[PDB]
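re the bet — no i am not wrong, look at it urself. input seq straight from the record:
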Amino acid sequence: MTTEIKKLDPDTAIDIAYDIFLEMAGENLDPADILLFNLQFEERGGVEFVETADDWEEEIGVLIDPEEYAEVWVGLVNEQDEMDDVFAKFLISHREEDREFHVIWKK
């Protein structure tokens, strides 16, 4: 505690979000997309931890503060390691006070 706003570690953020994709990924997600994720995810696993953006107030339906939120994208990648097929994106409030985590399924 040397500042006011603290971010989350790469492995830490991914860890939490990862568990959220395993527990959340259900009815909220499209059926067909659920299956594919079940058959192809191990060999084609994708979970890139991106940052916030300005073009947020369009998809989720609410403006978000940039460089102040943890953006997580969990999709399916190839053997070349990429991220062109995202399944669900999560947004976790970096800060400790108030934990606003809202994931988006098939936009």
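see?? The chain has one domain: 8-107. told u. also The beta strands are 46-50, 70-75, 86-92, 101-105. so pay up
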